[PDB]
Each structure stands twice: as structure tokens, then as C-alpha cells.
Amino acid sequence: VDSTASRYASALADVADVTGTLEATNSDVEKLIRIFSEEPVYYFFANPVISIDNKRSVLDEIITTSGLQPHTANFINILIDSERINLVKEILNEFEDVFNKITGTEVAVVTSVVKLENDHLAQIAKGVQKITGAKNVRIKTVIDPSLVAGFTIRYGNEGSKLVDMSVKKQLEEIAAQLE
């Protein structure tokens, strides 16, 4: 994808990569996402009517308490100057996808009816680094009851590639008995 939100996030990652603050910058970017969730905080930055000069002063105070990285504080200042603060949320989310690309890591999603153990997670991570080529592999879990018993993982560059065996047995048997 190449949209304005994606374009900005990619720049932010590239500067971190140059300066070797990829771990350090990523923590700050995660820290920002908590900040901009709040409807009141996001609204103040986003709306055109509030004066830009006031926005910087408030932003500086926010940066100090936060203790953000020197570029990360710039990056928000750049967004504010160039009017694209209305799409901060898209930009922040976009950065995570870019950050995985730079490391060479991959992300996976595995879902189950009941919570499961760590060795299963490590072996799914093994299989996903096999079929994907993660330099390293990463994993996430979301407990959903409306399946039968299985696990579904979800991976790829987007949340695209899906394999599972819980209810796909049953829906598959409906669609195979119509044959």
C-alpha cells in the first residue's frame, strides 16, 4: 500500500533505521498510540480551528512528560506543520507494519476456543518462519468461542494468509456433500 498515512510512517522508520534506534523509536511510537487514543486529546491536535502556535506549546509539554525520542518528537512536529495531523492514527498504525518489514520479522495470528500453552506457540512460530521466511517470527492470540476446537492462524504482510481446522471441516463437509 502507498497512501499518505503509509508514506509518512515509512519515513519515520527509515530515520530510526539509519540511527539504530529501531527498538528505541518503536517504543516511543507505541507510547504515542496510547496518547492519541483519547477522543479529547486527538481532537485538540486534529481540528483546524485551534491555533497552531498553541498546539506546539502543548505538544512540547506532552513530549517532556512522555520522554519521546528526538526524531519522534520532530516527526509529530513535522506532521503538525504540514497539516497531516488529521491522519495521525492511520500513520501510527501503518508504522508497525513497516517496522516488521525492516527487521525482517513476521507476524502471525492464532486463535482458539480455549487458552493454550507456550510450546504450541513456539512450534507455530517455527512453522510460520518456515513457510514465510521470517528472519524472526512473532505471534498473537485471540480467544474466540464460536469455533469448535481448532486453531486458526493469520499471517502475511497484511492479515491475509489463513489456515485452520475447526469448523472448516464442517462447512467443507456441507460443501462436499452438495457434490
Partner: protein, 499 residues
């Protein structure tokens, strides 16, 4: 938008706590469709030339808040994305000097005739202002085209904009070319701009100028059809600024634009690629201002400036004679007159195919000399008679001698008007031809005899009685001494041409 490319952005993050001026150089964001967007150049002026790594020049015109739109003069087919640009400091100029005579030249005033570099000391602006309301005077000198049908009946003065308008292959380039060939004796510098034409067609014209010595006072500004749309949009402004170097240096100048029609379609090509909202026939709104920046630069200047002139002869092609079309109707509202070359006459062998009744000139009698005002006044009233007499000629079919004389007179008045291509006639020869044909000294000849008689008649007067040329070149008036001395040679030529 264009600036948010992630390299430009990435650079910005690194330098945020910093003062900077990137005013000197810039980075190409994209090249496409005749324009380039360039990040940087924070102190270019609007209309400034910018230089690329490949050598392509562009005029900085769209100075937006983060980028600059640069109109590429040439193909941008080599301009690599990310390459560096250079602010020249100069603002849309061509070098111009006396060394352009004899040279075939580009729209960027670069030589394309393979004859080496051209030395120049001064410059002139491509978008330079027209003369004002007080910097002008009335058009009073004649500019002689050598075509009898213009110089007697639609006469072009020095400083006049006169339109050469007709369909394709009706002799439009010929009327422009024969006008340039006639400026040999006069101190008139011709400039020929060929916009979007066949390179074979321009090479024939340049060779015809070399063959006839017209390329010692002529610049040829040549774009072809293979050339990009910006250079065809540019080249009339180049050729006008070559013609303004001599105008404001007290010289007289003659500029020809071949297809103002093809400049209008190259600027239409540019602005539809620029995604600009068009109007009638998809031409944009700046189409009138396109050709009126150009043709208001043609002016007879006042004596407070040295009395330079610039006769502009633009050429507009019509589609099946559609004078109501948008591009012919814009130029007719700018131009002082028009010379309609019609295709019914060209197909009938009536070359030059000048439709006399529809062709007008704003300075009619002010342009012509006193020999032409006296003699060609009877020519304009006979064709007013003969236009009505060709009507109901076959209806009546019983032609009496109050009509059958005045028709067979009127057929040989057309035989006066036929000239061969690339052979103009001098003013003494025009006033000698129109005098004999109006009086009826040709009436006993056949229609295949008038063309051969007058060639023997002008060659008689050059050789044997040159006092007729002495009167018209000095007095510039058809004198009773000149009229009698001509009638003596009409008698001798009738004695020779019979036996």
C-alpha cells in the same frame, strides 16, 4: 501530494531543529506530460529558466508551496527522478544578436543547421511586453509581397498583423515564402517560424532561401511535428523575440508564423495533460491570450523609439473553410486583416488562390504608394463589377457589348493576378501589369497568351526603357511622364509579340 515522497520527508525529520536555505538547487519529483515537479529551489522567480543534469532547460511557472512546476523545454525522456536541478538566475531569455542571420535555429535558439555555434552578446525575454498605447504610430510604409493580388488589393503595411488563412494545400506557405523572397532590396529582416511542420517541408524552404539569397536576412525558427508540444508552444515567442531585437534597434522586421493553428494545438496538448478545464473544441481559456501575447508585439513603433516595425503574417489553417471555428475566429479578432486562400481556386489552377472579395486589410490606402493608390483603384472597382457580371452570365447567354467586353476584360484581369511560385514582382512591374490589364490592352489576346505577353513586356522595360523604373522608384507616383513612357513600350511589345 507531490512533496510527500518519504525521502523528502525523511530528510526533513533529520533537519527539523535547523535553519536552512535549499534556494540554490532542487530534486526532481516526477517527470511526465511536459511538466516536472521539483522539490526545493526556494528562491526561484516565476518564469525563471532552470537547468537539469541531462541538459534540458525548463521554465519555472507553477511555484507552489512545497514544489515547483517546471515546464520542460524539450523531451523529458532522459530526466532521471531524484536528479539535481539548477536555478540559472536568468528569467526566460534567448540570446539574440546579428549573428542569427543565415541560421536555421531551434525554439531554444540553438543552431540546428549543423553550422556551429552562434555568438551573441545581448538577451531578450521570451515573454516580453508588447508596445504600449503611446509607443506606437500609424502604419504607413508598405511591405511589398510581390504577389499582385496582395500588393494592389489587400496591401500589407509595415507594422500590420495580416492573417494568411485557408485550408490545407492552398499555397499558404507560398504567400509567406514569396513575401520573404521579395525583401532582398529592402532593409527588412525576415523571421520564419515553422511550428509543427514536416521537417522535409522546412528543409525545402531553407534550401529555397539559400538558392535565392534570402538567407542573408532571414532567421528560420524550426520546430517539427516530431518535436514536443512545449517547444512548438514556445517557438513563436522565440521567433518574435528575435524579431524584437531588430525592432527596438530601429530596423524593420517581418515575422511569419506557420501554423498559429499548430501552436494552438500544442498548447491544447500541454494543458489537457496538465488536467486544465477546457472550453470550445477542447481548447483552454488561455487560447486567446496565447496568440494575443504574440501578435500584439507586432507594431509600427513611434519616432521617439526609432521607428522599428514588425509585420506579422501568421498562418491559420481552416477545416473546409470553417471561419466560424474557434482558432480562426480568435486570430481574426486579433489581426488587422486576413488573406483568404480558397480551395475552389487552388484546385482550378488560379494560383495564388487568393479570394479577393473576402480578403480585407485595415490599412488599405495608407500602406500603398501613390502609384499603387492611383492605378490599383481602378482594379478594385472592376472586380466589383466583374463579380456581379459572372453572375447571370449563363442565365442571360446573349452577351451584349456592354457586358461581353466587361466580362472578357474581367477574365484577363485574373490573368494579371496569376503569378508563378517563388517569383515575386517588383512594384514597378506590378503597376505596369495592372495598368495594361485595366485599360484593355490585352483584350485581343487569348487566355493562354496574357501570361506569356506580360513576361515579354516586363523584360522589355528592364532592358530597353529603364526610365519607367526611375520614375516609380524615385517619385513613387504614377506620373503623366511615366504613363506616356509606358504606353510607348506597350505599342512596341504588341508589334513584337504579333510577329
Amino acid at each position: 501530494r507531490a512533496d510527500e515522497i518519504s525521502k523528502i520527508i525523511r530528510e526533513r525529520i533529520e533537519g527539523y531543529n535547523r535553519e536552512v536555505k535549499v534556494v540554490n538547487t532542487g530534486t526532481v519529483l516526477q517527470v511526465g506530460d511536459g511538466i516536472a515537479r521539483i522539490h526545493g529551489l526556494d528562491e526561484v522567480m516565476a518564469g525563471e529558466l532552470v537547468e537539469f543534469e541531462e541538459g534540458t532547460i525548463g521554465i519555472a511557472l507553477n511555484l507552489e508551496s512545497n514544489n515547483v512546476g517546471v515546464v520542460l523545454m524539450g523531451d523529458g525522456l532522459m530526466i532521471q527522478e531524484g536528479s539535481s536541478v539548477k536555478a540559472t538566475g536568468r528569467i526566460a531569455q534567448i540570446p539574440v544578436s546579428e549573428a542569427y542571420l543565415g541560421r536555421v535555429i531551434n525554439a531554444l535558439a540553438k543552431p540546428i543547421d549543423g553550422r556551429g555555434e552562434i555568438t551573441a552578446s545581448e538577451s531578450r525575454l521570451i515573454e516580453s511586453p508588447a508596445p504600449g498605447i503611446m509607443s506606437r504610430r500609424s502604419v504607413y510604409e508598405p511591405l511589398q509581397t510581390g504577389l499582385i493580388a496582395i500588393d494592389a488589393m489587400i496591401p500589407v503595411g509595415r507594422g500590420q498583423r495580416e492573417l494568411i488563412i485557408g485550408d490545407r494545400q492552398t499555397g499558404k506557405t507560398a504567400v509567406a515564402t514569396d513575401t520573404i523572397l521579395n525583401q532582398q532590396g529592402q532593409n527588412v529582416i525576415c523571421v520564419y517560424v515553422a511550428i509543427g511542420q514536416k521537417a522535409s517541408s522546412v528543409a525545402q524552404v531553407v534550401t529555397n532561401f539559400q538558392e535565392r539569397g534570402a538567407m542573408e536576412y532571414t532567421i528560420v525558427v524550426a520546430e517539427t511535428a516530431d518535436s514536443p508540444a512545449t517547444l512548438q508552444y514556445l517557438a513563436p515567442y522565440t521567433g518574435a523575440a528575435l524579431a524584437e531585437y531588430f525592432m527596438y534597434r530601429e530596423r524593420h522586421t517581418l515575422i511569419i508564423y506557420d501554423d498559429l493553428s499548430k501552436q494552438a494545438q500544442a498548447y491544447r496538448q500541454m494543458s489537457l495533460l496538465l488536467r486544465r478545464p477546457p472550453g470550445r473544441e477542447a481548447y483552454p481559456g488561455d487560447v486567446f491570450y496565447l496568440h494575443s501575447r504574440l501578435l500584439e508585439r507586432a507594431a509600427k513603433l513611434s519616432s521617439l523609439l526609432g521607428e522599428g516595425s514588425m509585420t506579422a503574417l501568421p498562418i491559420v489553417e481552416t477545416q473546409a473553410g470553417d471561419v466560424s471555428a474557434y482558432i480562426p475566429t480568435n486570430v481574426i479578432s486579433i489581426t488587422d486583416g486576413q488573406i483568404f486562400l480558397s480551395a475552389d481556386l487552388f484546385n482550378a489552377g488560379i494560383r495564388p488562390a487568393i479570394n479577393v472579395g473576402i480578403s480585407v486589410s485595415r490599412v488599405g490606402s495608407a500602406a500603398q504608394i501613390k502609384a499603387m493608390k492611383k492605378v490599383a483603384g481602378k482594379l478594385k472597382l472592376e472586380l466589383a463589377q466583374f463579380a456581379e457580371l459572372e453572375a447571370f452570365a449563363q442565365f442571360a447567354s446573349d452577351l451584349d457589348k456592354a457586358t461581353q467586353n466587361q466580362l472578357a476584360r474581367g477574365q484577363r484581369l485574373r490573368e494579371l493576378l496569376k503569378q508563378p511560385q517563388s517569383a515575386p514582382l517588383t512594384v514597378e512591374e506590378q503597376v505596369m501589369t495592372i495598368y495594361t490589364g485595366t485599360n484593355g490592352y490585352l483584350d485581343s489576346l487569348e487566355l493562354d497568351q496574357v501570361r506569356k505577353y506580360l513576361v515579354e513586356l516586363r523584360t522589355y522595360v528592364k532592358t530597353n526603357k529603364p526610365e519607367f523604373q526611375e520614375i516609380i522608384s524615385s517619385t513613387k507616383t504614377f506620373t503623366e511622364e511615366a504613363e506616356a513612357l509606358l504606353k510607348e513600350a506597350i505599342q512596341e511589345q504588341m508589334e513584337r509579340f504579333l510577329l
